[PDB]
């Protein structure tokens, strides 16, 4: 079961400054008595933070109890300030539904509890606690937890209720990051005596947890208590929390002899901060100094690809009824299409997908001036030979890749097609030749071969047919089974894009520093109109 709420005001979103607030240890490396300048997701100094509240009015006629779904960026700075231990925990997740796993972190009445499950969350996830002396009553957090793949519980402790009125006495600060499947939690605690906002001040947050959760965290919201003296008419009181977003920025950190951070400069904050970071030092002598740009970093990205929508015919190219024999491999142009390889994932799994001069997962966001696909079948044992600098009966006499090859070699097993016995098309390879082929050279000649440089008029001694059949019976072992191969050869010239990856494309942004990607040519800079022809 769950509690319910009504007369609930929307969040007001009043904003405050993270005045030097919320520094944390960027990595696990122990450093002592050094200055470290580093790029990471940090909360910038004097960044905005959005406040959320829990307050009854003079009466329940109207109430704030802010538990919206809050987006999670590259990370979150979170600060709770409170007196009566109102903010108990968080739910981190994607959908925050039983349709996907969520992490619940609870500073529960006596234990920290971390659980990852498909949760049926309550509509307003909360604790219920009996106000005067009750350390607990009920937990309207979730109805069900169907597939719990992680759990952690911390050792027993006690919480004071601290129900007295007035100024907030506690400030609890957190940073959340989700990297390589770990949720990192950093935290710190500060005594405070304040009525509104975050107090100004430097904070360093120590690492509390690495949680091997593996969740897709994109949203979170807080779990808070509501209070009652009579286990009825629960009400909200006495807390606010502030959320700020980490942004990729350069900080310079000062490490003590004990390796604690004790000062930091946000290099983007002031000209004096850029100076301090430039001279790698917190104190600077009188002078004029050249200063390295930490002022401006790109945030927007402009991605602009030709508006050709037709998908490439890889289904047609790959699922042909029969392929060429490797001695007679066929070359085809691929053009005016989007090379989405993911269309194949439902149909064919590739035993080989090796790319040269291009990485196979940048391949999804390049564009190419031309693409050629060479198609043939070989033994699975021979797919080794389809690479630059290989040697053997295929590389020597059937199909040679150039040393300067750029492209991808793709192969998959097709014993279910090319090794069927059902009237099957035969596959051949050239076994004998007087010399090695040149790269992308072909030799479809079928004149009888003699080791001697002589005509045959076969049958004769020292005369042989140059082409061997492959033994693609269904009985043969996988080395002898057929593999289809296509070799895609690319070129990335200063010429119009002919094939492109599936990237969506965005409006131009001009006179601002941005990341950009034009036809896969990607960098950062300012875009303007130009006089160029």
């Amino acid at each position: 079961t769950c509690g319910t709420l009504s007369n609930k005001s929307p969040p007001n979103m009043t904003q405050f400054s993270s005045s030097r607030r919320g520094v944390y240890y960027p990595d696990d490396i122990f450093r002592s008595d050094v200055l470290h300048l580093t790029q990471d997701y940090f909360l910038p100094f004097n960044s905005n933070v959005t406040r959320y509240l829990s307050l009854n009015s003079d009466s329940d006629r109207i109430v704030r109890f802010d538990n919206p779904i809050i987006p999670f960026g590259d990370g979150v700075y979170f600060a709770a300030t409170e007196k009566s231990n109102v903010i108990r925990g968080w739910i981190f997740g994607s959908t925050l539904d039983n349709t996907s796993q969520s992490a619940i972190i609870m500073n529960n009445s006596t234990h920290i509890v971390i659980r990852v499950c498909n949760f049926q969350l309550c509509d307003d996830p909360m604790f219920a606690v009996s106000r005067p002396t009750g350390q607990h009553y009920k937990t309207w957090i979730y109805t069900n937890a169907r597939n719990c793949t992680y759990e952690y519980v911390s050792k027993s402790f006690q919480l004071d209720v601290s129900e007295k009125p007035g100024n907030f006495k506690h400030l609890r600060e957190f940073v959340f990051k989700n990297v390589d499947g770990f949720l990192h939690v950093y935290s710190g605690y500060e005594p405070i005596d304040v009525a509104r906002g975050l107090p100004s001040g430097f904070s360093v947050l120590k690492p509390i947890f690495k949680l091997p959760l593996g969740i897709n965290i994109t949203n979170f919201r807080v779990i808070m208590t509501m209070f009652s003296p009579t286990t009825s008419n629960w009400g909200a009181e006495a807390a606010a929390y502030f959320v700020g977003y980490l942004k990729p920025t350069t900080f310079m950190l000062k490490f003590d002899e004990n390796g604690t951070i004790t000062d930091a400069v946000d290099c983007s904050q002031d000209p004096l901060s850029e100076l301090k970071c430039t001279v790698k030092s917190f104190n600077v002598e009188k002078g004029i100094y050249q200063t390295s740009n930490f002022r401006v970093s790109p945030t927007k990205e402009v991605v602009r690809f030709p508006n050709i929508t037709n998908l490439c015919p890889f289904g047609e190219v790959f699922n042909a009824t029969t392929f060429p024999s490797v001695y007679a491999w066929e070359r085809t142009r691929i053009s005016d299409c989007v090379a989405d390889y993911s269309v194949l994932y439902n149909s064919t799994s590739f035993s080989t997908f090796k790319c040269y001069g291009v990485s196979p997962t940048k391949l999804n966001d390049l564009c190419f001036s031309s693409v050629y696909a060479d198609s043939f079948v070989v033994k699975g044992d021979d797919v080794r030979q389809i690479a630059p600098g290989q040697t053997g009966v295929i590389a020597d006499y059937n199909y040679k890749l150039p040393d300067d090859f750029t492209g991808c070699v793709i192969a998959w097993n097709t014993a279910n097609l090319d090794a069927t016995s059902t009237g099957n098309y035969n596959y051949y390879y050239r076994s004998l030749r007087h010399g090695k082929l040149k790269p992308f050279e072909r030799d479809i000649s079928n004149v009888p071969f003699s080791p001697e440089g002589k005509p045959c008029t076969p049958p004769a001694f020292n005369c042989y047919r140059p082409l061997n059949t492959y033994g693609f019976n269904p009985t043969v072992g996988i080395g002898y089974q057929p593999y289809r191969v296509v070799v895609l050869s690319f070129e990335l010239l200063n010429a119009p894009a002919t094939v492109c990856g599936p990237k969506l494309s965005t409006e131009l942004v001009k006179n601002q520093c941005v990341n950009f990607n034009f036809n896969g040519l990607t960098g950062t800079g300012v875009l303007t109109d130009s006089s160029k022809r």
């Binding site: 122990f30 002592s32 004990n258 390796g259």
Partner: protein, 49 residues
């Protein structure tokens, strides 16, 4: 050392100390030939002293 620290390094990343994992005693590591050494010779082909 800090209670969980296993080794220490100077500003050159020379590992100058290590925690013995059995004793938890901290050992200093010195380089195998600390400091300068220099040999006075008259010429070879006048003395080998």
């Amino acid at each position: 050392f800090q209670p969980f620290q296993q080794f220490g390094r100077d500003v050159s990343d020379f590992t100058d100390s290590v925690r013995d994992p059995k004793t938890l005693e901290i050992l200093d590591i010195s380089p195998c030939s600390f400091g300068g050494v220099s040999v006075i010779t008259p010429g070879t082909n006048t003395s080998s002293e």
